[PDB]
Swiss-Prot record, chains A, B, C:
Its EC number is 5.3.1.4. Homohexamer. One of its GO terms (biological process) is L-arabinose catabolic process to xylulose 5-phosphate. Mn(2+) binds at E306, E333, H350, H450. Keywords: Arabinose catabolism, Carbohydrate metabolism, Isomerase, Manganese, Metal-binding. It catalyses: beta-L-arabinopyranose = L-ribulose. The lineage of its organism: Bacteria, Pseudomonadati, Pseudomonadota, Gammaproteobacteria, Enterobacterales. Pathway: Carbohydrate degradation; L-arabinose degradation via L-ribulose; D-xylulose 5-phosphate from L-arabinose (bacterial route): step 1/3. GO terms for cellular component: cytosol. InterPro entries: Ara_Isoase_C (IPR024664), AraA_central (IPR055390), AraA_N (IPR055389), AraA_N_sf (IPR038583), Fuc/Ara_isomerase_C (IPR004216), Fucose_isomerase_N/cen_sf (IPR009015), Lara_isomerase (IPR003762). It comes from Escherichia coli O6:H1 (strain CFT073 / ATCC 700928 / UPEC). The keyword 4Fe-4S does not apply. This is L-arabinose isomerase. It is an enzyme of class 5 (isomerase).
Length: 498, 498, 498
């Protein structure tokens, strides 16, 4: 059912004819054996298709050429069962659009001390065949990945599997379409940037439909379709008295529903995966989309507030990326602090748009709905608490000449006293290593007030993403120390400054 | 005896023409003591020749003129006795083509508290005088190693001699001559490169003589001389049943012996110090040089397989580097692996060519050969085990615009079982910090399958080597971590990308 | 029959739906009309295949994806009949392996002053639609070409056609295989270099077979096949008395013939397009290949003397490139000068290997054959004079970090007195602007003694090649003036020094 099922990774084996052609026939036995046992037992994010052996230049070019042409081909994992003169690969590697991982593995785990002979020695020579390959890729500054490990090693499966994840994320982004409903909040910098650069670098496109284009779909929906969706609320969520049938703010639940249907139909018919809104342009909408934006985020779409295409895009990438994983992933603003010796905290939220995928409960749908901001009707919104434990918050910023991705490892924690006046969903966390330093470093390194929160993905996941896209990663966890942190900033600046 | 008897290090001393033939003659006295003290007591790689005092610019410029012209001057060791304003050193240091080391030292291991005068402070004042000199070395951006200590210091003797050792290596490489017998294995990358560039940088030359040429010399050796060498094989090694008289492959031993004599004679007359071969071009040679190659490696000749001049030269270099040290140093190629929790191992070896320099025993010689590779006669070889202990493998790769020296720290270990069918000698080691990262880090950095294995030389030797040549040293050892390693590869790329 | 017939160029029209879909239908009428009239009447180097209109992002990605996959697709020529929002093209353009030329043309030549209206105005808006496209390509630093001109403009056809030429040259080079028969003349720099860099940058591969591998094929040929080829000589060429049946050097014509057959069979069975020899390794050959190398160059193969793969490669590229053109293209060494007020000259040649494609006559096959060099039998060689008029000489050199292509516009001229002792073919020329300055500049800018001479190609042809491959071109013709010439060298050095 998932987008992972719309891709497969190619298992290419490198060798040469020198010994052959029955020395090849063993190689093929191994490959087919390792491919089946992985597809069967290694619980990897998507499928491995074994291609015919690459033992000549033309065979290797062929495979890369094919890999570029096949839209499901998300990456290559190459095993060099033997020596494989690396010049053979050059012409293929210079046309390759798809990512590559060397699986520096071997058929046997134990070296058969008592039996080993030259036949053996000259078969399963990945020990050196993998190093010849290492070189050309390094020589070309072509970022190839490596996992060393025996082919049944479950630790390897993970790192292999974790890489397959990024391959698919990289190709989905190459089709991701953000639909903004208006422009950036006036006078705001971070949420602005060069959209051309984004689509060049990342392949996702951002383009603006009039709020009025939406309003038209938003107004067109049938009551039959509205009251249907109104039922799915009462089913799913705790309705606060104000929200119930005879409640003075029932009518506002109707307007929420339609804005959900309206946005969903516009977004499906447009073929979109993400979107923005701006409270400075809600002409023809009854209320700022809250409930609707929250549920569309649960249903999968990327979103960010006030025109913020980068963060909205990012959310969608990290959701997709998170498929099959234990948690969350939500848009998030760092809203307010709690200061105390030992217990410094952040509380995250926005005006309304907090995704219910990181919640732990059955979730109230109250109004208590004054939003002076926007200047519209009291909006519907889901109110909830965020799950505990170790998360991350990611901010992608545009330094103008390049992008930088900041990640701050964090730990959600339970609110000690509850928030009875606060009509928004919360997320409360301690920022590794500690607020003052965590905040300082983030601020030092730019990094928006807009972030993507996530329980399901982590730092190592994001490190591979940063690699896969060739961008700087600015990491802020417990190891962070400002003198070193600053040096890195400088040294990365020169490096990525080409 | 050995090549360290060819070279010398000059012992220059720095003061000003002002003032006091006493003071200025009084200083001459100490340099004559420390030098004589060091030359009999210190056990340094080669002698220290004291030179007349650098008091004026012209004298320093002369000292440099001579130091450049004198082909056994391996470098200057400089100690700044009184105080020698560095503007005097300019014209000299500017022309100085031989390496320099500031031995930053005093007269006198401790301090006269009641016996201190201005007459004393006039003369012998390296504390400040030494610093001024570092400045100009830094300003001009020259190397200038510095060792600080009291001359009588055991630790400081050690430090200076290791430098002296490198200084001499630098000079020997200048005259090093590789001789290639055929070209690279077809379609191979790591072992190709720009010979012109290497000769510019390190000064070693690489030029190829026809396989046909060698054959002419091999086909010329007298049966008398051939037989005589075999008498040396009987006495050196453990001749296997087939190897000895009435042996089924006794002639293969003679042919090997003939080859070795021809190859030797050839190399000697052409004044060569290293060589390569290629199994793809052996026309006129009865079998692929194995035993011949091994004993020649053991006698001091650098070599590396299938046309690999870089590694071949590096072997010769490191072999000379290691002179007067306990331990082996060999050509080596990661051949296969043993994956076992806690005990990941690499079996090193080559087709035939491994140096008995690194062996534990009196070596067995066998034929049990059938080398499918090439397609020649069952060739002779020395089978043996590699010693137990700390070692390094090193590779010099050409990245197009610059060279990179990779060195992995390792620890060789007893084969836990005999290897009865392995027709070749072996090395066996655990890689620091562990196989997967050891291997992965090397692949990320490129780094040949061909390496120079050494028991005698260490990371520190190679560190100075890399500094001495201004090449990047990539270091894989117990302290390695992939995030910092990767960072260093990027931050170095832009440093040395100049 | 020619390799041009194995490729086609794609004619892609960019537009958008804004007006459509019958506004598109006109666009298609135009495109089909312009494609037919060009394929019919424009005598272009190869075929134009009109692809379906690109009016959306997915359609544009599709076309580029297809262009990469189709091996005959040599380049794209895009016409922007209307405005074509350039973001649509980004994702296609970021995957494109093939070269692109914008044909900034229009359907009508004259603006129909009296009739023009908005319908018209908004159709045929290439005036601005072409500038939107210009931008993205410029923004991406993607070297796209442009010819502006009406679509019937014959001057345009040329510049379009001239570009199509380079597209095909660029793809052939991506399959060109040099087969060296040995290594570089010892101690020679220019002919040496980094073969990995070449195959990366250019896609042609260079790899060394043993002279003995050839000798085996060289010796295997049948007399029936030898004497057959001996007849084709007497037919084609003037046989000097020494060369005739009872001539004392007839036997040497037999050995020439076999070396021709032998080299031709080895080269066809290897699938090669170019080759080198080295006189320092002719073990098993009767005489240095002269006659044979000359005729194989006429038949099409690239060649250069003494191991020189770059120049041999280049020759083959410039021959292929020259298909369908008036002249020549030959390997060439600048052999000797004539100095005289007003009449300074160069005479070009090699020991033997001068291609008879630039000759004007029926061509003597004498021996007068002492070649002390090589140390072999008196060789057969064709002796001839070169055609008059404006030519070029191209040298591709490896500056180590990058390549530079030098071109010197020259003018062949008739020898005033004849060369009765000189047993080699001549080419005599004046080097624009004049020997002293022409020689100086060439020497200043490096540039080998080995060149490719050519009557058929020129400077503008080579300028597009240099562009198509992104390398420096150092031009030396009449406009050349050393102060400016030097400045350019410096300014290009910084630019291409990334
Ligand atoms: Mn906000
Ligand atoms: Mn090898
Ligand atoms: Mn020549």
């Amino acid at each position: 059912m998932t987008i992972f099922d719309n891709y497969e990774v190619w298992f290419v084996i490198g060798s040469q004819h020198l010994y052959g052609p029955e020395t090849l026939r063993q190689v093929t036995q191994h490959a087919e054996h390792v491919v089946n046992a992985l597809n069967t037992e290694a619980k990897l994010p998507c499928k491995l298709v074994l291609k015919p052996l690459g033992t000549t230049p033309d065979e290797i070019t062929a495979i890369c050429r094919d890999a570029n042409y096949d839209d499901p081909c998300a990456g290559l994992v190459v095993w060099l069962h033997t020596f494989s003169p690396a010049k053979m690969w050059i012409n293929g590697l210079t046309m390759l659009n798809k990512p590559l991982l060397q699986f520096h593995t071997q058929f046997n785990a134990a070296l058969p001390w008592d039996s080993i002979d030259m036949d053996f020695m000259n078969l399963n020579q990945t020990a050196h065949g993998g190093r010849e390959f290492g070189f050309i890729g390094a020589r070309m500054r072509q970022q190839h990945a490596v996992v060393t490990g025996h082919w049944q090693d479950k630790q390897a499966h993970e790192r292999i599997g974790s890489w397959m994840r990024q391959a698919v994320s990289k190709q989905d982004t190459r089709h991701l379409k953000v639909c903004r409903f208006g422009d950036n909040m006036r006078e705001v910098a971070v949420t602005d940037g060069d959209k051309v650069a984004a689509q060049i670098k990342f392949g996702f496109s951002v383009n603006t439909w009039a709020v009025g284009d939406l309003v038209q779909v938003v107004n067109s929906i049938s009551d039959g379709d509205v009251n249907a969706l109104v039922d799915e609320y009462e089913s799913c969520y705790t309705m606060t008295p104000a929200t119930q049938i005879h409640g003075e703010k029932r009518q506002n639940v109707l307007e929420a529903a339609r804005i959900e249907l309206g946005m969903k139909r516009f977004l499906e018919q447009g073929g979109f995966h993400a979107f923005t809104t701006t409270f400075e342009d809600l002409h023809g909408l009854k209320q700022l989309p809250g409930l609707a934006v929250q549920r569309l985020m649960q249903q999968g779409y990327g979103f960010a507030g006030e025109g913020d295409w980068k963060t909205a895009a990012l959310l969608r990438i990290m959701k997709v990326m998170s498929t099959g994983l234990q948690g969350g992933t939500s848009f998030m603003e760092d809203y307010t602090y709690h200061f105390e010796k030992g217990n410094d905290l952040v509380l995250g939220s926005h005006m309304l748009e907090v995704c219910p995928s990181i919640a732990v409960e059955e979730k109230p749908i109250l109004d208590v709905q004054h939003l002076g901001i926007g200047g519209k009707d009291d909006p519907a919104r889901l109110i909830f608490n965020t799950q505990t434990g170790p998360a991350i918050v990611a901010s992608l910023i545009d330094l103008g000449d390049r992008y930088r991705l900041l990640v701050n490892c964090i730990d959600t924690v339970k609110t000690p006293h509850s928030l009875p006046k606060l009509p928004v969903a919360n997320a409360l966390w301690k920022a590794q290593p500690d607020l003052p330093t965590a905040s300082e470093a983030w601020i030092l390194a730019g990094g928006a007030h807009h972030t993507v929160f996530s329980h399901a993905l982590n730092l190592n996941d994001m490190r591979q993403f940063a690699e896969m896209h060739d961008i700087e990663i600015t990491v802020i966890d417990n190891d962070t120390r400002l003198p070193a942190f600053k040096d890195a900033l400088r040294w990365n600046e020169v490096y990525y400054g080409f």
